[PDB]
């Protein structure tokens, strides 16, 4: 792609997300989602192979269905309220439709069925955009409509997301599908605490964006897309195996790492509201996520899988790739737990 056209299209993606974030009118929310989808389609089709066309087609179908259900919820809101303010919804049917539409735009279960396909079909940079930047606009709308969200619906979606994103990555060897099922499980964690304390939702969103950005930047810096290609990283750049080790042990929610911070604050804010069974099942189901993370760490850093002889030529060359903010994102995704009461800046 033309670099000028790439920059203009990325500004259009960012602009659509900003238009969802800042606007007070529902038509501008819908316009922002349309702008976001319309501009992120060429980022997915950057390489022009049939898997990217398939992934972009499936992404188009799901986000288009979600955008039409979103405009239907907005239309029933205009029926039952005669106004357009982005706030609580004045009808439980409009609340159900908008919660379904935003769950489809996130890819929460049972509408999760596009996320590993589209994430595997597209490159690692576009997958990074899809799994980090695209989660900002629907979580902003869910932050704005939480006085009308049905509790049973959002908690059903959250636990179904956590369980399916747990059992999904247990069968996988492709890294993009693993990150996508990790995304489904972590969005379940985020929306489980939404109607209790949305500051912890924003905390989990920021920590998850930092950790996922770290893992996709490590995958781009090593050019590895499978588990077995990630295995040869100890013979090429051994510091990267240490970084994927600490980041995957972070993303499993293991203390003293800062990926323990979001789910611990979520349990801390859900037990206040006399929910004990639900964060217990959430915390026990997170062990599946940690299990396939430990599978990756065994394959990559804790053991040494056999390499090939052509690695000796790659010993003679440095990484010329722009590893943008990778030490910064690495330090923030692991060593941020002593700074845990910084979550008040999100209040």
């Amino acid at each position: 792609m033309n670099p000028i056209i790439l920059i203009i299209i990325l500004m259009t993606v960012m602009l659509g997300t900003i238009i969802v974030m800042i606007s007070t009118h529902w038509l501008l929310i819908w316009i922002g989602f349309e702008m976001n989808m319309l501009a992120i389609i060429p980022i997915m089709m950057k390489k022009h192979n049939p898997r990217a066309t398939e992934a972009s087609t499936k992404y188009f179908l799901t986000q288009s269905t979600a955008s039409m259900l979103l405009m239907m919820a907005i239309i029933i809101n205009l029926m039952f309220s005669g106004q357009w303010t982005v706030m609580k919804l004045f009808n439980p049917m409009a609340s159900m439709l908008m919660t379904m539409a935003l769950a489809m735009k996130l890819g929460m279960a049972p509408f999760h069925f596009w996320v590993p396909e589209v994430t595997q079909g597209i490159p690692l940079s576009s997958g990074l955009i899809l799994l980090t930047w695209q989660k900002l606009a629907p979580m902003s709308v869910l932050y704005q409509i939480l006085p009308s969200i049905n509790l049973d619906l959002i908690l059903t979606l959250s636990i179904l997301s956590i369980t399916i994103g747990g059992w999904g990555g247990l069968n996988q060897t492709q890294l993009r599908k693993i990150m996508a099922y990790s995304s489904i499980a972590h969005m379940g964690w985020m929306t489980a605490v939404l109607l209790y304390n949305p500051t912890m939702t924003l905390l989990n969103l920021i920590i998850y964006i930092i950790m996922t950005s770290t893992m996709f930047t490590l995958f781009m810096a090593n050019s590895t897309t499978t588990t077995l290609s990630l295995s040869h990283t100890w013979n090429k750049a051994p510091i990267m195996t240490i970084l994927v080790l600490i980041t995957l042990l972070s993303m499993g929610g293991l203390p003293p790492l800062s990926g323990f911070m979001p789910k611990w604050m979520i349990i801390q804010e859900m037990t206040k509201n006399d929910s004990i069974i639900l964060p217990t099942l959430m915390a026990i189901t997170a062990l599946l996520n940690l299990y396939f993370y430990m599978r990756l760490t065994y394959s990559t850093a804790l053991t040494m899988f056999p390499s090939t002889n052509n690695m000796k030529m790659k010993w003679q060359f440095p990484t010329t790739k722009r590893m943008t903010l990778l030490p910064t994102m690495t330090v923030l995704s692991t060593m941020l737990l002593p700074l845990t009461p910084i979550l008040s800046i999100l209040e």
Partner: protein, 99 residues
Amino acid sequence: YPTKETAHWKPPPWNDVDPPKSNLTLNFGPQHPAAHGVLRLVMELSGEMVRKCDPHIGLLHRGTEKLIEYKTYLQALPYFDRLDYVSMMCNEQAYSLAV
């Protein structure tokens, strides 16, 4: 974990680029048969562009210059009016100059 159902699956390509798994051939002639009318052209179009043009001819082959062999020179003169049938006396003049 390979099951009974998920056993026919292959690993994806390393570059994630799949194999792709031709153009139009037109049989073509002049629209209204008044000027030419007796032309067959086997086109190989590429959308708009023309790649190969194959004029199939012989549709007005009469075997003139075999019929000339069995007639005298005066009798074979009017065969030349009908070769280029808009340049009659020029072909008459060329055959006349040959004889």
